[PDB]
C-alpha cells in the first residue's frame with residue numbers, strides 16, 4: 001500500500017491511498033500487460049473468527065461474496081481547522097492504517113506538533129485481536145514500564161506506516177513531511 | 191529553533207509521496223497548470239511504474255477530494271470480487287482458510303479499480319485530458335529509471351517470495367537470476383504499451399480492451415476468476431465521506447467499503463472525553479487511554495463493517511458521540527481491560 005497527498009496553488013487538496021495489498025501483491029503480472037495483480041481478496045474474512053494476514057477478523061458483513069468489495073482500512077484523511085483544509089494525510093499499514101492516521105490527527109491537534117514532528121514521532125497500536133499493545137522503538141523505558149503495570153502487554157515490533165502529509169498554514173503557506181520509515185520518498189513543492 | 195524536525199515549505203503547491211520521481215511528476219503537473227486532481231492522477235500513474243510494490247494499475251484504492259470551496263467527496267475504486275467468487279472459496283477441504291489461496295494464487299485477485307477511479311476523478315474534478323497525465327508514467331516505463339535503495343530492498347525481500355515464480359513477472363523484475371540491484375535500470379516495455387493504449391483509448395482499454403483480454407487470459411489459463419464480464423462491469427463509485435468533529439476540528443475520511451473513516455472518528459469521539467493535551471505525547475496515560483479506545487473500535491470493526499452495497503453498516507451509531515461516551519466511561523486509566531472481555535458494542539440505543 002502507498003499514500004500520497006497533494007495541494008495546489010488554489011487550495012484544492014487530494015489524498016490518495018491505493019494498493020495491491022501486500023508488497024507486489026500476488027507478484028503475478030497479467031500476461032503481456034506488464035501489470036502486477038493485487039491479492040486484495042485476503043481482506044475479506046475467509047471464515048468467521050479466523051484472522052487474515054493483518055490479524056483482522058470478521059463474519060457475515062465482510063464475508064466473501066460475488067461482486068463485493070472487501071473491507072479496507074485505508075484512510076486518506078483531511079482535517080479542517082477554522083473552516084479550511086488544514087492537514088492532508090494518510091498511510092499504508094493494513095490494520096495499522098487506522099491507528100497511524102489517528103496518531104497524526106492527535107499529534108497535530110492535541111500535542112500541537114508541526115507536520116514533521118507528528119510524522120517523526122514513534123507510533124503504538126492495539127487492534128483488539130491479537131491482544132497486545134504494539135509499539136515501535138522510541139518510547140521511554142519508564143513509560144513502557146508504567147503501561148505494563150497498567151496491564152498492557154507491550155510488544156516491540158517493526159516500524160509502522162509511511163505518512164506523506166501536508167499542512168496548510170493560516171496564510172495559505174504549505175508545510176509537508178515524508179516519513180523517516182520510508183527511504184527514497186519525497187515531499188516537494190514550489 | 192526549538193524544533194528538532196522541520197517540515198518542507200512551499201508557497202504555491204506541494205506533493206508528498208513515497209517516491210521522489212513520482213513526487214516530482216506531480217509537482218511538474220502543478221507547475222504546468224494542472225489542479226490537485228490532475229497532479230494526483232499523474233502521481234498515481236507514475237507510482238504504478240516507479241513503485242511496483244504498491245503503486246499500481248492492477249489494484250485499487252480510495253481518493254479523498256476537497257475543493258478550495260469546501261466541497262469534500264470520496265472516490266471508491268476498491269476492487270470487486272469476481273462474479274464467480276464464493277463465500278468459502280478460500281477454505282481447504284477441511285474447512286480451514288488457506289492463506290496461499292488468498293495471497294499468492296490467481297484466486298487472490300479482485301477486479302482492479304485504479305484506472306476506473308482515476309478517470310472518474312479526472313473527468314469530473316480534473317482539468318487535463320488523460321493522455322497528458324499518463325504521459326510522465328509512459329515515459330518512465332518506456333525509457334526506464336534507475337533502481338534505488340527502496341526498490342532494490344523490496345525486490346530482494348518481498349519480491350523474492352513471489353516475482354521469480356511467474357514467468358512474465360521474472361522477465362521484468364529479475365535479471366541474471368537475481369532481483370534487480372540498486373543502480374540497475376528498470377525498463378517496463380509491456381507496461382509502457384498498456385499505458386500508451388490507455389492514454390489513447392481511455393479507461394475502456396483496461397476494462398474492455400487489450401488489457402482486459404490479457405487479464406482475462408492470465409486468469410483463465412491459471413484457475414483465476416476475473417473474466418471480461420467482471421472487467422466490463424467494474425465501476426468506481428463516488429460516495430459521501432465519513433466525518434466527525436474533534437475539539438472543533440472536522441475530520442474527513444473514507445466511508446465503507448473502508449473502515450478507516452468510521453473508526454478514526456469513533457476513536458476520536460472516545461478520546462475527546464479525556465484531556466489528551468494534559469497527558470501529552472509518549473505518556474503512559476495518553477497511550478493507555480488510546481490503546482483501550484482502539485480495542486472497542488476494532489471489536490466493532492469485526493462485526494459491523496463491510497461493503498455498504500451488500501450489507502447495512504450502522505455508521506451513524508458507530509460515530510455517535512453518546513456511544514463513544516459509553517465507551518469512554520468504561521476506560522480505566524490505571525487498568526487495561528483484556529480483549530477477552532470486549533465484544534462488539536450494542537448499538538440499539540444509538541440508532
Ligand SMILES: N[C@@H](CCC(=O)O)C(=O)O
Nearest residue numbers: 001021072073092093094
Ligand atoms: N489491503 C489493505 C492495505 C494494505 C497495505 O497497507 O499494504 C487495506 O486495504 O486495508
Ligand SMILES: [Ca+2]
Nearest residue numbers: 179180182183
Ligand atoms: Ca523518508
